[PDB]
Amino acid sequence: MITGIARRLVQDGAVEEAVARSAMDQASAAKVPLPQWFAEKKLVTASQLAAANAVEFGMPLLDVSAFDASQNAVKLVSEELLQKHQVLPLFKRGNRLFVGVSNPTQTRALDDIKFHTNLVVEPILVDEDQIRRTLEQWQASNAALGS
Amino acid sequence: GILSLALKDKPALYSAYMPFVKGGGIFVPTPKRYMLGDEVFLLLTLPDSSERLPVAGKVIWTTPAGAQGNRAAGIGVQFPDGPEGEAVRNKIETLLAGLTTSDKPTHTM
């Protein structure tokens, strides 16, 4: 019976089949959304969880640490939205604003950003930690251009 | 363990180039699964020449099989900074003169 990210995480070798069964069983008992369970129980790493999230949802995954910060798009989104959702806007091309997310179901942030920005928003997977660290760095860079 | 990417023309080179990567990147379609951070060796052909340019790169992007959109499965490969990589970024940036500012979408962003 192991399916979902529970399945992928053992595909990718991130955690054993036994301890994946636990998480399905206990996250059902707790009525807790399974990937949050994995994340909060610290059974796998933020990047491990994101690699499964990607294969699981047909969504691309990016290492932002290789992203050239000078090209970011953080400034196109209010800081207020940046707080309400843990998301990391990455890059504009034409209409598109690519927005890094740690959870691919997290549709509320994409609609809020579309409305705010009147651009086409496509999501990209970035793992939860890189979103946190890289956002604050990119904000330091942008801040060096002025108030 | 040797990827090969050959780009017949400028459009194909545009689809593949990752300008938002530090030092530059190229998308390589492959069914093989790779982890972020893997060092990988690529043999790259650009459209101006039959010369095959070795590129020893780190994986920095993946697209899974059966990805949403018509997105193609593969990996983004960061050029190593330093002379060897900087040469390939440079060749790509001049070949793509006149498309650098295009809106048209790519294999990545």
Numbering used by the authors:
A (entry chain B): 11 to 157
B (entry chain C): 9 to 117
Extract from the study:
Type IV pili (T4P) are thin and flexible filaments found on the surface of a wide range of Gram-negative bacteria that undergo cycles of extension and retraction and participate in a variety of important functions related to lifestyle, defense and pathogenesis. In Xanthomonas citri, two cytosolic proteins, PilZ and the c-di-GMP receptor FimX, are involved in the regulation of T4P biogenesis through interactions with PilB.
To better understand the three-way interactions between PilB, PilZ and FimX, we determined the crystal structure of the complex between PilZ and a PilB fragment (PilB12-163) corresponding to the N-terminal domain of PilB from the phytopathogen Xanthomonas citri that causes canker disease in citrus plants. Native and selenomethionine PilB12-163-PilZ complexes were crystallized as described in Materials and Methods, in space group P21. Two native crystal datasets were obtained, one with the wild type sequences and another with a spontaneous P70S mutation in the PilB12-163 subunit. The asymmetric unit contains two copies of the PilB12-163-PilZ complex (chains AC and chains BD) and the overall structure of the heterodimeric complex is shown in Fig 1G and 1H. The PilB12-163-PilZ interface buries 1026 Å2 and 1018 Å2 of surface area for the AC and BD PilB12-163-PilZ dimers, respectively, as calculated by PISA. PilB12-163 is made up of two sub-domains, a four helix ND0 (α1-α4) and an α/β ND1 (a β1-β3 antiparallel β-sheet surrounded by three helices (α5-α7) and a string of three consecutive short 310 helices (η1-η3)). The most significant difference between these three PilZ structures is that the electron density for the last 11 PilZ residues (residues 107–117) is well-defined in the PilB12-163-PilZ complex, while no density is observed for these residues for PilZ alone and in the FimXEAL-PilZ complex. However, the F101A/F108A double mutant no longer interacts.
